[PDB]
Amino acid sequence: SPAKKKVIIIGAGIAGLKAASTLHQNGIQDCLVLEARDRVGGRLQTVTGYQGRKYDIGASWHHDTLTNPLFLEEAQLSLNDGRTRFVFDDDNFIYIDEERGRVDHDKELLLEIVDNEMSKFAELEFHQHLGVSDCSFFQLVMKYLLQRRQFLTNDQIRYLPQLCRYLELWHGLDWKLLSAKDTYFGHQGRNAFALNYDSVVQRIAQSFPQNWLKLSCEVKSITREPSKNVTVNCEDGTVYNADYVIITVPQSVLNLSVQPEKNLRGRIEFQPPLKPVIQDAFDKIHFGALGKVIFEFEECCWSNESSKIVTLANSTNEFVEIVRNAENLDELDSMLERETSVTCWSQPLFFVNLSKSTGVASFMMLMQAPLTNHIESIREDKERLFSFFQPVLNKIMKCLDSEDVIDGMRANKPVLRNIIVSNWTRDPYSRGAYSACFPGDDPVDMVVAMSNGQDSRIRFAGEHTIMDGAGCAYGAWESGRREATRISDLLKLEHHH
Amino acid sequence: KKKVIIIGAGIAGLKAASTLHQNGIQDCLVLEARDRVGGRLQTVTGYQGRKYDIGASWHHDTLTNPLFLEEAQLSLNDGRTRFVFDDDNFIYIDEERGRVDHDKELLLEIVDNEMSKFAELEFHQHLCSFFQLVMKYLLQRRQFLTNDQIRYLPQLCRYLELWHGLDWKLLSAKDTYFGHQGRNAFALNYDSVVQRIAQSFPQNWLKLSCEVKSITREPSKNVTVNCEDGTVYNADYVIITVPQSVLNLSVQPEKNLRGRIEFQPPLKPVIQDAFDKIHFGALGKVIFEFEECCWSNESSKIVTLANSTNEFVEIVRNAENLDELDSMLERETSVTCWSQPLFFVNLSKSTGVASFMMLMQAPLTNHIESIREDKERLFSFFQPVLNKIMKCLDSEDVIDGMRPIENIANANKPVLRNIIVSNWTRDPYSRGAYSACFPGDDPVDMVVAMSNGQDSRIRFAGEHTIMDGAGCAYGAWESGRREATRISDLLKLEH
Ligand SMILES: Cc1cc2nc3c(=O)[nH]c(=O)nc-3n(C[C@H](O)[C@H](O)[C@H](O)COP(=O)(O)OP(=O)(O)OC[C@H]3O[C@@H](n4cnc5c(N)ncnc54)[C@H](O)[C@@H]3O)c2cc1C
Ligand SMILES: Cc1cc2nc3c(=O)[nH]c(=O)nc-3n(C[C@H](O)[C@H](O)[C@H](O)COP(=O)(O)OP(=O)(O)OC[C@H]3O[C@@H](n4cnc5c(N)ncnc54)[C@H](O)[C@@H]3O)c2cc1C
Ligand SMILES: C[C@H](CCNCCCCN)NC(=O)c1ccccc1
């Protein structure tokens, strides 16, 4: 009765999609891709807004373009058909502070130069160091400020740590939640902003039997039959038997398995239940919440000096002094505690001025946890949002040679026609943006348990199941190629005399 | 009669002696060939009494630089000014185009960074010249580079030539892109440093004008050395801090070459072989002392970009591979101030003094120094880049006032008074600037062989006997503290 399949992939993300791609590439037949949503791509979603303009509300860039297998693949096509599939939108960051204004590439602040030293500082703190406990990124930025106060001006000690935090937007975590040992990481080359990441999702989705894909099926349970087979159940009731299965649900969704309540959207009931080595890996790795807010304006009425703009939080000169007075490290850590609402200036905000990179009059901004859940929890209040960001929006426009902004959601002035927010933290099938490390996190743990699988037939792929390009789309891609290739290798023994 | 005999009065010998003395060791000799200490640390005076470090000038790796810490200590202590952090946003200038730094569309700095990462990868876990490498990158990534980026980038990234004192066709790629551990500290008089160390041990220990031309280790556990003129000396241990370049003459015929020390028996094979991994780097300097400051003080760091062509881009855009792009490169010399990248430190913004401290590289260094007496020629050679810098700095063409004629018309206009050039490549006690790598060198077998001395009596120190700060000032300083303590410990333990 239950349909016989060779390999059943759970999840139509880039990971499962690539698994499905590789499988068909290796002549594996009768396969099946089961996806809860009614769309493929998963955390690679391209939405539409005002005038029909499009933006990736999930991944946007191809990182490490020097080694990124997925990118080079995408680059090969464009190099052969001349079609624009991306664009290196790296630029010189423009740093704005509420009071001061633009403190970037400054002759007396030299902020970027001390950031690199701050970076190297961190590097010397870890990179090749056994034992060295962790501590938050915030703590680390404080330690540097303390161990080097003798060579930092009053303005550096104040404005530096704020610029330093643009990193929060790489990780999706606030500097107090972020693990230092993991804050600083190398980038293998420039970034390539994807001109339709969904453009990539589809290429891969059309590379294998279209009947393999069955959307809107939420997998409730996965069972390994003592007879060496895996049975998968969709909520709608359909049941399938398959020799192998490649599980690609988000680390967050997979985590729902180590708990009671089999009525949590997304959760899969595992029989036998996930190995103790897996669930326990969950303790040492966590989830981040990178969030996005697209600010669509009517026309490009602002300076395109750059495409990367970050607004620094707020700093106080009393801080400078505390750093100027602290006798020891703990004293500083202590003191500061001195004890209130969150506003657009309570954390760094990363704005991507698409008007220079894509010729579109919109701003793609990145937020981090905790602001993400908050902003996402109220994405439906387009007014409470415009109210929230108006100040930074104005401040930015001020520095970009333009007047304040005119809310025109429902003429040389900038008009905000529409606002789009991400829903990753609220999406039961997503539960966050992607993998991230908290202080004391051995991300190597999850990767190992994951890349090794539940057993011979219950495997794992996804941004968390791989090390190289972990958290990145291309990592999830490679993970898909991986698990499929292995399955493909095992099935190769089939045609042996 | 002497406990330790230190050969060389450089930063190495001076700390090596300082340390011995700080350890209570007596009867010591410091034998220098020159009439002064400091070695490659020499301060000189020019117009209106200004002082410039014609040799070392920066505190590198100020996060781990032991010496630098020591210096900041005193500063925190006695509030004096012993240095100024001058790392500034580099201003890149092309003859034709002008400034190209921090350009909204060229974004050279960003791609220069990919270039670095590209090199790092090219060598990560590997069993080629800096030029070969830039060409590889360009060919490999041309698909994601604009024509202008391809054109200028390579010329900009060559600022690295002034880190190694070598052109990008003679420098080893595997050693081009090292990494700096923290900001740099412009030493306000590196001589103030030479003097403090210098004064920390008994003055009557120094024997200036002693060209040690032979080191011998008598069987009966004694080390005896003789200086050119005559004076023979003997010691228990002997810290040889003469630079590599000179010590490399210890393996040739006509054993007389100035500064050439001849050991007996000779320097063991593990040492001789090390001199087969280049080290002929010649970084030179040329101070341009002006009347008064009258040019934009935007940045304290500037670099002129050797001319670049558009046919270069066309060739990169059309080459089918590393082989073709290689040959297609070459055609049809005349060396001008625009035949190489030039690094100008604008001392106006960092020190107040209306002067430019310029760094040059091999093979140019050798040329410009060999004509360091002809100020007229030196002015002609540099006038063009000097004017271009002035243009780009909200100023105007430089007036040659090296043979002065006070005139009012020189209101705003900048007036060049003096010009001071290094001589490192012609000084027999130097024979270049400092360690560098030719395509194929290996900065390890020399640092190790050297740090393992000849035997227990004959030790080596300097900027070519350590891995941390190798070739750098703090490196040598440390190599000297190293050889001393290692000896002061032995002597102490001897009952
Ligand atoms: C806001 C944001 C911005 C990002 N930006 C970048 C970037 O710029 N560059 C980059 O490289 N990466 C970026 N990433 C990360 C990148 O998007 C992910 O690493 C990648 O998309 C993960 O793909 P995946 O297949 O591993 O997981 P997913 O894309 O989440 O796919 C998992 C699939 O599982 C499905 N599913 C879950 N449970 C079930 C179930 N029980 N039954 C059936 N189906 C189920 C989900 O619907 C989903 O389709 C970003 C991520 C976010 C959230
Ligand atoms: C132009 C230039 C710029 C530089 N800038 C910097 C910088 O900014 N920052 C930095 O960290 N480093 C810099 N360096 C390198 C640094 O200055 C040197 O590595 C350092 O000075 C070496 O010190 P030393 O004691 O090891 O060698 P030396 O300074 O050469 O001392 C060795 C001594 O041995 C003497 N001697 C040689 N032969 C004999 C002999 N036969 N008998 C007796 N005595 C002899 C020599 O005269 C010399 O006095 C620069 C070098 C140059 C040339
Ligand atoms: C002392 C340093 C030379 C490089 N030293 C190499 C030793 C470090 C390798 N581990 N100075 C320079 O050439 C220089 C010149 C301009 C700006 C910065 C550095």
Swiss-Prot record, chain B:
Q: How is the cofactor bound?
A: Binds 1 FAD per subunit.
Q: Which InterPro entries match?
A: Amino_oxidase, FAD/NAD-bd_sf, Flavin_monoamine_oxidase
Provide one Gene Ontology cellular component.
cytoplasm
Give the E.C. number(s): 1.5.3.17
Keyword list (alphabetical) reads:
FAD, Flavoprotein, Oxidoreductase
Identify the cofactor(s): FAD
Tell me yes or no: is Metal-binding among this UniProt entry's keywords. no
What is catalyzed by this enzyme? spermine + O2 + H2O = 3-aminopropanal + spermidine + H2O2; spermidine + O2 + H2O = 3-aminopropanal + putrescine + H2O2; N(1)-acetylspermine + O2 + H2O = 3-acetamidopropanal + spermidine + H2O2; N(1)-acetylspermidine + O2 + H2O = 3-acetamidopropanal + putrescine + H2O2
GO BP annotations, alphabetical order: pantothenate biosynthetic process; spermine catabolic process
What does the record give under GO molecular function? N(1)-acetylpolyamine oxidase (3-acetamidopropanal-forming) activity; N8-acetylspermidine:oxygen oxidoreductase (propane-1,3-diamine-forming) activity; oxidoreductase activity; polyamine oxidase activity; spermine oxidase activity
Note, other: Present with 6960 molecules/cell in log phase SD medium.
What family does the database annotate? Belongs to the flavin monoamine oxidase family.
Cited function: Involved in the production of beta-alanine, a precursor of pantothenic acid. Multicopy suppressor of fenpropimorph resistance.
Name of the featured protein = Polyamine oxidase FMS1
Please spell out the taxonomic lineage of the organism that makes this protein. Answer: Eukaryota, Fungi, Dikarya, Ascomycota, Saccharomycotina
